[PDB]
Amino acid sequence: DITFRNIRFRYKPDSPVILDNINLSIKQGEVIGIVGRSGSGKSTLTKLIQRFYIPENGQVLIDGHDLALADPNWLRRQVGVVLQDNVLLNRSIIDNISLANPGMSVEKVIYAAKLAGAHDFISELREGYNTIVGEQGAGLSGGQRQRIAIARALVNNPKILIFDEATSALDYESEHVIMRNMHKICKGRTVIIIAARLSTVKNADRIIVMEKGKIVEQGKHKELLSEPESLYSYLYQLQSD
């Protein structure tokens, strides 16, 4: 349902090759984890899904549609991206979550906040969902902001959801709620998670290991650990050393 075929990418005609002959099929309903060293090409890979950039070689396809000849506006709607950092607008928490669709009532707002694990702390603020967030973003803490951003992205409701280190600063309990809810979140859609914390993607249907712009290893968490000399094993065994 999402296909990378013979993808070769570099940023400038002078730039070194960033993505080197990548081939990948991601079928609808799959949770895909993407791991690898800092600078290996994880983010660049997700940018071709959005067509901020075009490859010099190969094709990107969604549902059999070549993105190179697809409608620009159509593609924008299909992809929702949650980054590491998120600025919230100087308005209420409910308004911030409902950005993509007001008129959508309090219940689907709360459900989105319950999925993101935000409803608890919002209920215990005095002003509640009517709490006006900062003129810069953070009248709240980093993780609270980030959970509001996740709740908003769920309301946005794209058919392709990209988490780019979205949870890596959240505490284990907070991330667990979101990863526990991943079964409801990815119903009828594709979820792509780029993680530095390997434990985040432990239950992905497929984990992709990037190195120097190549998909170097692949499989489930336990399948990747079967080879002790694998790159995935080396990073995993660095958890506490």
Residues at the annotated binding site for ATP? 36-43
Q: Would you give the DSSP letter of residue 28?
A: T
Rounded alpha-carbon distances, angstroms, from residue 203 to 36, 46, 207: 17, 20, 9
Q: Does 119 bind ligand ATP (CB under 6 A)?
A: no
Q: Does 142 bind Mg ion (CB under 5 A)?
A: yes
**Binding residue (CB under 6 A) for ligand ATP from 3, 40, 96, 156:** 40
**Binding residue (CB under 6 A) for ligand ATP from 13, 14, 38, 228:** 38
From 98-106, 140-148, 154-162, 211-219, span contacting Mg ion (CB under 5 A): 140-148
Q: Does 107 bind a second copy (CB under 8 A)?
A: no
Alpha carbon of residue 84 to chain centroid = 9
Rounded alpha-carbon distances, angstroms, from residue 186 to 30, 140, 143, 193, 201: 7, 28, 22, 12, 14
Using the minimum distance from each CB to a second copy, give the nearer residue, 6 or 141. 141
From 24-32, 34-42, 106-114, 148-156, span contacting ligand ATP (CB under 6 A): 34-42
Q: How many chain residues touch a second copy (CB under 8 A)?
A: 42
Alpha carbon of residue 231 to chain centroid = 22
Q: Would you give the DSSP letter of residue 189?
A: S
How many beta carbons lie within 10 A of that of residue 2, not counting itself?
21
Q: Would you give the DSSP letter of residue 51?
A: T
Q: Does 199 bind Mg ion (CB under 5 A)?
A: no
Which residues contact residue 108 at a Cβ distance below 8 angstroms, ignoring those fewer than 6 apart?
155
Report chain breaks in the chain, C–N > 2.5 Å, as residues after which they occur.
none
**Binding residue (CB under 6 A) for ligand ATP from 1, 59, 143, 225:** 143
Using the minimum distance from each CB to ligand ATP, give the nearer residue, 57 or 226. 57
**170 token code pair:** 């959240």
Q: Does 165 bind a second copy (CB under 8 A)?
A: yes
Q: Would you tell me which residues interact with ligand ATP (CB under 6 A)?
A: 11, 15, 18, 36, 38-44, 138-144
